[PDB]
Amino acid sequence: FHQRCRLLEGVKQALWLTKTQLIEGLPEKVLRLADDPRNHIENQDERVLNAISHARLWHSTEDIPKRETYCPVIVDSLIQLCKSQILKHPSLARRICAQNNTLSAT
Amino acid sequence: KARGNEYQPSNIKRKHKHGWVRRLRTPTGVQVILRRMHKGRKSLSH
Amino acid sequence: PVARYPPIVASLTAKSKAARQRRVEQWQATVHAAKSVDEKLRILTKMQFMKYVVYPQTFALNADNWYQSFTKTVFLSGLPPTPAKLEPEPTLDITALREAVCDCLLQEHFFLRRKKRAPVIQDREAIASPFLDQLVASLTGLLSVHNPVLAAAALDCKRPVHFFWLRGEEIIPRGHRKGRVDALRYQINDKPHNQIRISRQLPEFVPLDYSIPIEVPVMSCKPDKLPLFKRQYENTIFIGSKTADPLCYGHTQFHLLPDKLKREKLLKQNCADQIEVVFRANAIASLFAWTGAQAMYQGFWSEADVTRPFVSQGVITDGKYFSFFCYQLNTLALTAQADQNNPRKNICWGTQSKPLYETIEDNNVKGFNDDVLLQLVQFLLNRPKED
Amino acid sequence: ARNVLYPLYQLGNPQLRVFRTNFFIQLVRPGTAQPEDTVQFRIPMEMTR
RNA sequence: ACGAGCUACCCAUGAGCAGUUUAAAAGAACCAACUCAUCUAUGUGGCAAAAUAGUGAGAAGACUUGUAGGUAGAGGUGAAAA
RNA sequence: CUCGCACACGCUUACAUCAGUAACUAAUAAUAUACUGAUAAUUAACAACCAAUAAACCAAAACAACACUAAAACGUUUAUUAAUUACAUUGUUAACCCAACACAGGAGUGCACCAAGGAAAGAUUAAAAGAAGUAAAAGGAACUCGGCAAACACAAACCCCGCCU
Ligand SMILES: [K+]
Ligand SMILES: [K+]
Ligand SMILES: [K+]
Ligand SMILES: [K+]
Ligand SMILES: [Mg+2]
Ligand SMILES: [Mg+2]
Ligand SMILES: [Mg+2]
Ligand SMILES: [Mg+2]
Ligand SMILES: [Mg+2]
Ligand SMILES: [Mg+2]
Ligand SMILES: [Mg+2]
Ligand SMILES: [Mg+2]
Ligand SMILES: [Mg+2]
Ligand SMILES: [Mg+2]
Ligand SMILES: [Mg+2]
Ligand SMILES: [Mg+2]
Ligand SMILES: [Mg+2]
Ligand SMILES: [Mg+2]
Ligand SMILES: [Mg+2]
Ligand SMILES: [Mg+2]
Ligand SMILES: [Mg+2]
Ligand SMILES: [Mg+2]
Ligand SMILES: [Mg+2]
Ligand SMILES: [Mg+2]
Ligand SMILES: [Mg+2]
Ligand SMILES: [Mg+2]
Ligand SMILES: [Mg+2]
Ligand SMILES: [Mg+2]
Ligand SMILES: [Mg+2]
Ligand SMILES: [Mg+2]
Ligand SMILES: [Mg+2]
Ligand SMILES: [Mg+2]
Ligand SMILES: [Mg+2]
Ligand SMILES: [Mg+2]
Ligand SMILES: [Mg+2]
Ligand SMILES: [Mg+2]
Structure with missing residues (x-):
């Protein structure tokens, strides 16, 4: 199963091949970690509104950017917004990103 | 509606x-080359 | 009871050169009357005449000397003069920074395994490019606690930068427009590896009217001998984002030299002094396009000049050898009819190329230079003045 | 060399060596302005960089 | 024998249609680019072996158009004008 | 007064510097993008040249959120191979091409309508006839095959033949 493999019953086949149980909704640890106002960036509403506009309209000289341009930009822009919380939580420096690694599990 | 310019140049078409390659691919084409060589033409084909 | 003499300006519809100047001065006044900065850029860049295409990463034997003439830039050896301010200096633990940078080197070199490479030549373009992505991200996050500005800044990864300007004049040698005067137009299409943009402008290094004894070199040949080739396409002035973006200023740039400009390639081509030329040529062209684009997004142009100097920083690197540059833009009226009397000049301080690591092998970095790391930290600690 | 038949190259062939070159070079004065380091030559058609 | 570089039709591969009116990109409507050529006047060894000036019809379609290929005279092709 | 810059296709040095034109070329003269002689030139980043097999994948382009009928150009990833070795070769001029002409004709795309490109009159006199344009007393189709043409008009209705584009 590589990246470009399509499954017909995507939720059902993945559940069967992995022997998992689907639970609707994010876990309570994750969900209660975002409802607290003490875990919000400054101007969260405004900056995200700028991130969406920058991703889809501002980042390119053309009037209508194509999807392959604004799909990785919007994700990286949102990563930077939550990366700025390292000053409030000085433990995010333990993270690092990797690109196009080779993974295998049989 | 104003004839006289029927020749529109094009190197790909010409x-x-x-061309010399086409002249040698058909048996009738080769006879055209033979006739022009016999007559003494300076240019057998394009 | 007072005579009212008509003005003594030249005619407007005549064929004479004085009339043509008045026609030119007519559209010059159209830009002034425009309100939105977008409309000013539209009028300046709506004509599509021939222009030279300037590549920041070039193989010309003497590129920095020619690029200075096109830009009116005087290159100063060494780092820019110190701010001479000893306000409370941050305390940074080098061990944490050293470990973070070493982890970036060890990952993309030894730890992170790639797909099998049949050539086995191990192209440095495919290895150093992900290293720069992690190095910028690692240092921006780590230094965010000491510099709050980097938290609010935006990171751009391989985003094009464009600039367009006129310089000097030329008499057309060949064609039906023979003998008529036509200005020389230049274009810079740059793709910086990384960018940091700030809502607030960085402070200046030297005052706007800074008199330097050295002069801009003047070539005695056509630009076609560089070589440079004329081309015609859209004239674009770009900062990495459209004008509506609130982040209209820049902080630093990161550039990666391509495969064709490696140190090993230059040695085989019998090129010794060309190693530093490539670094200098890349910084002068890239930084000027960035600083020039910032000025024109604020409404400043050839007839409005520049009120406050625009400062941007650059870090040209190839994968192992790092160079640091600082650029300050004082002049924007580079047009021949507007540069008749302009004593101001653009200054670009530069640094000699220095290695960062040495013979990294088996998750062990043998050699390491902290001064390069310390210099990189100093660049990322630059902050706008607060009020 | 010009007007000669080069050996066809396959994998592992020996280095190609020419001992008496058939090429001849003219050094000419440039007709336009040239930089200080540029020298202009006239070379036969079968000569590469 | 040689000709589909003009033209009739078709197979590939591309590229154009702004504004205005309407739930409409409806072989609808107003009007340009663009494509045809209704009427009259000049022209008639002429600018032109079929044009110029004014005026006209279509202008999101059965529409115009570039490149290149296919069908050849007892034939090709044709929304038949021999 | 306003069809301007560039690419593709085509043409093939007709381009540039200097000199000469009694005569040849321009439908004339000055003169030289167009005639003669000598010398010189277009430098690659743009453009051409620029891997094969096996496997997974029913889900349109129209700001594409989602839909219509006429059912639609536009590929990624995994696997097995792929000489690995600075600098290869080729197109870069022009006022140009197809029409016997330096022809009021024909000619695809991008961006502007200008900052760019150009000159309707060789010099006179101010006859007829002819062509093109503007204005008019009173009348307003009495002209004529027909309101053809022209107009400060730019509307209304009937009939014949085809349904309509
Ligand atoms: K054919
Ligand atoms: K004609
Ligand atoms: K020619
Ligand atoms: K009658
Ligand atoms: Mg003929
Ligand atoms: Mg044709
Ligand atoms: Mg055909
Ligand atoms: Mg329309
Ligand atoms: Mg219609
Ligand atoms: Mg007409
Ligand atoms: Mg007419
Ligand atoms: Mg009339
Ligand atoms: Mg109509
Ligand atoms: Mg109609
Ligand atoms: Mg045949
Ligand atoms: Mg028949
Ligand atoms: Mg038909
Ligand atoms: Mg009949
Ligand atoms: Mg009949
Ligand atoms: Mg000819
Ligand atoms: Mg003449
Ligand atoms: Mg002369
Ligand atoms: Mg000559
Ligand atoms: Mg004639
Ligand atoms: Mg005249
Ligand atoms: Mg006359
Ligand atoms: Mg008369
Ligand atoms: Mg009248
Ligand atoms: Mg009257
Ligand atoms: Mg009557
Ligand atoms: Mg009568
Ligand atoms: Mg009649
Ligand atoms: Mg009429
Ligand atoms: Mg009747
Ligand atoms: Mg009918
Ligand atoms: Mg009927």
Whole structure:
């Protein structure tokens, strides 16, 4: 199963091949970690509104950017917004990103 | 509606229709080369 | 009871050169009357005449000397003069920074395994490019606690930068427009590896009217001998984002030299002094396009000049050898009819190339230079003045 | 060399060596302005960089 | 024997249609680019072996158009004008 | 007064510097993008040249959120191979091409309508006839095959033949 493999019953086949149980909704640890106002960036509403506009309209000289341009930009822009919380939580420096690694599990 | 300019130049078309390669691919074409060589033409084909 | 003499300006519809100047001065006044900065850029860049295409990463034997003439830039050896301010200096633990940078080197070199490479030549373009992505991200996050500005800044990864300007004049040699005067137009299409943009402008290094004894070199040949080739396409002035973006200023740039400009390639081509030329040529062209684009997004142009100097920083690197540059833009009226009397000049301080690591092998970095790391930290600690 | 038949190259062939070159070079004065380091030559058609 | 570089039709591969009116990109409507050529006047060894000036019809379609290929005279092709 | 810059296709040095034109070329003269002689030139980043097999994948382009009928150009990833070795070769001029002409004709795309490109009159006199344009007393189709043409008009209705584009 590589990246470009399509499954017909995507939720059902993945559940069967992995022997998992689907639970609707994010876990309570994750969900209660975002409802607290003490875990919000400054101007969260405004900056995200700028991130969406920058991703889809501002980042390119053309009037209508194509999807392959604004799909990785919007994700990286949102990563930077939550990366700025390292000053409030000085433990995010333990993270690092990797690109196009080779993974295998049989 | 104003005839006289029927010749629109094109190198791709000229070398594909009257080229040396085409002249040697058909048995009738080779006879055209033979006639022009016998007559003494300076240019057998394009 | 007072005579009212008509003005003595030249005619507007005549064929004479004085009339043509008045026609030119007519559209010059159209830009002034425009309100939105977008409309000013539209009028300046709506004509599509022939222009030279300037590549920041070039193989010309003497590129920095020619690029200075096109830009009116005087290159100063060494780092820019110190701010001479000893306000409370941050305390940074080098061990944490050293470990973070070493982890970036060890990952993309030894730890992170790639797909099998049949050539086995191990192209440095495919290895150093992900290293720069992690190095910028690692240092921006780590230094965010000491510099709050980097938290609010935006990171751009391989985003094009464009600039367009006129310089000097030329008499057309050949064609039906023979003998008529036509200005020389230049274009820079740059793709910086990384960018940091700030809502607030960085402070200046030297005052706007800074008199330097050295002069801009003047070539005695056509630009076609560089070589440079004329081309015609859209004239674009770009900062990495459209004008509506609130982040209209820049902080630093990161550039990666391509495969064709490696140190090993230059040695085989019998090129010794060309190693530093490539670094200098890349910084002068890239930084000027960035600083020039910032000025024109604020409404400043050839007839409005520049009120406050625009400062941007650059870090040209190839994968192992790092160079640091600082650029300050004082002049924007580079047009021949507008540069008749302009004593101001653009200054670009530069640094000699220095290695960062040495013979990294088996998750062990043998050699390491902290001064390069310390210099990189100093660049990322630059902050706008607060009020 | 010009007007000669080069050996066809396959994998592992020996280095190609020419001992008496058939090429001849003219050094000419440039007709336009040239930089200080540029020298202009006239070379036969079968000569590469 | 030689000709589909003009033209009739078709197979590939591309590229154009702004504004205005309407739930409409409806072989709808107003009007340009663009494509045809209704009427009259000049022209008639002429600018032109079929044009110029004014005026006209279509202008999101059965539409115009570039490149290149296919069908050849007892034939090709044709929304038949021999 | 306003069809301007560039690419593709085509043409093939007709381009540039200097000199000469009694005569040849321009439908004339000055003169030289167009005639003669000598010398010189277009430098690659743009453009051409620029891997094969096996496997997974029913889900349109129209700001594409989602739909219509006429059912639609536009590929990624995994696997097995792929000489690995600075600098290869080729197109870069022009006022140009197809029409016997330096022809009021024909000619695809991008961006502007201008900052760019150009000159309707060789010099006179101010006859007829002819062509093109503007204005008019009173009348307003009495002209004529027909309101053809022209107009400060730019509307209304009937009939014949085809349904309509
Ligand atoms: K054919
Ligand atoms: K004509
Ligand atoms: K020619
Ligand atoms: K009658
Ligand atoms: Mg003929
Ligand atoms: Mg044709
Ligand atoms: Mg055809
Ligand atoms: Mg329309
Ligand atoms: Mg219609
Ligand atoms: Mg007409
Ligand atoms: Mg007419
Ligand atoms: Mg009339
Ligand atoms: Mg109509
Ligand atoms: Mg109609
Ligand atoms: Mg045949
Ligand atoms: Mg028949
Ligand atoms: Mg028909
Ligand atoms: Mg009949
Ligand atoms: Mg009949
Ligand atoms: Mg000819
Ligand atoms: Mg003449
Ligand atoms: Mg002369
Ligand atoms: Mg000559
Ligand atoms: Mg004639
Ligand atoms: Mg005249
Ligand atoms: Mg006359
Ligand atoms: Mg008369
Ligand atoms: Mg009248
Ligand atoms: Mg009257
Ligand atoms: Mg009557
Ligand atoms: Mg009568
Ligand atoms: Mg009649
Ligand atoms: Mg009428
Ligand atoms: Mg009747
Ligand atoms: Mg009918
Ligand atoms: Mg009927």
